[PDB]
Design a protein around this ligand. Sequence first.
Ligand code: HEM
Ligand code: CAM
Ligand code: CYN
Ligand code: K
Length: 405
Amino acid sequence: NLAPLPPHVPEHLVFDFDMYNPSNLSAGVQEAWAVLQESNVPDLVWTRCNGGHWIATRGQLIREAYEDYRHFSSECPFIPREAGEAYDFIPTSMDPPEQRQFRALANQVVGMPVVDKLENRIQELACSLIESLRPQGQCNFTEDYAEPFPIRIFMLLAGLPEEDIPHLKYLTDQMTAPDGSMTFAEAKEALYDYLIPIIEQRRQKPGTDAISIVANGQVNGRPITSDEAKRMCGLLLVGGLDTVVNFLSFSMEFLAKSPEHRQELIERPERIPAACEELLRRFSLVADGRILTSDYEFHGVQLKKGDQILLPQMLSGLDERENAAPMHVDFSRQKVSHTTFGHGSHLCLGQHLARREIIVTLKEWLTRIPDFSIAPGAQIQHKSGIVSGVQALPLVWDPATTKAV
Ligand code: HEM
Ligand SMILES: CC1(C)[C@@H]2CC[C@@]1(C)C(=O)C2
Ligand SMILES: [C-]#N
Ligand SMILES: [K+]
């Protein structure tokens, strides 16, 4: 299903990469995308897949374009165009200067002071889950830990009842790696539908939860509207229910397959914060994009107004020009270069919450279940898209090797 080459796009720059189903997906998704950085591939290519779009394949260009919001607008960040056009989440669908007032408000509800405040709860949720799993000697890591640990933290943060988790998790899945049950726009509207009545309840009775704070915030010298609160809370939901969930699985799949890396963190726990950055580089998983606001020549390439450009956050840290032996995981790597949380004015607001969840997971899992591996006869399957992920991760261990601290 290829779209015909637009007239202004030179055919010598075509490389038909499919972001929702890469060729080498069997070898791992970061591997599958890494083909965009083979010797023969230009720094900037055009794929005719998914409606047709540009792809920057190197961190230098990826960074540059994320810095230049004049030319590369986040007004239409999702591929395909239909999704990107429907996309109106706040702050992501906004450029500076308009973006910054809304980003300050969102930073209030997931930024570092919130995270510090939630440290003991994060720790308790991890411990509770792991202690419950520990004697079993096995789990599906994605649905037994990777999903409920971040999601319960987020529901706590947002003041939303855990009974709603199955509903909301289903909706977020479909905006990110769509099956076909519902379009991006349909999944987005359903999430908006969930939120509106909750926002209205909390505007009148102002509280401490993320939704109350947003709903009662002030932007550009006026109260925020219900419609604006909704567009912002919907986005926070997506971040809290999907991306960290999928990153934890990549990291745990790797640790499960690499006893020596588990051992290094067990033996030298002080390296865990540095280890968290090197996993974030290696198992980077996001890829959205921008849309051209005007005709623009970018690195010798003529981009036209309305062109979409995929700027894969994933690829910058896998670029051998920024990190030697990029596919190798080295916890003592001297300068870990990545853009896993993005680059420019949309730099992930959740990054401090994410790092805490990752670091607490590494610490608590490895303290209690130091020895584990992939279940016998299992092959791990990755999924690709805006946010790539792990389909399933069956783990096993001898409960006699486990610890209660
Ligand atoms: C490993 C975990 C995570 C990764 C890799 C990640 C990745 C990213 C990336 C690449 C962006 C920028 C997208 C762009 O420039 O268009 C972003 C933005 C954002 N993230 Fe995350 N994320 C993670 C976790 C979280 C969490 C836990 C939250 C909590 C709510 C969150 C909330 C947000 C929000 C609100 C934005 C929009 C910022 C803006 O547009 O100004 N994220 N993330
Ligand atoms: C691309 C993102 C990671 C960023 C936060 C959630 C996400 C899917 C968005 O829609 C904006
Ligand atoms: C961010 N997700
Ligand atoms: K849009």
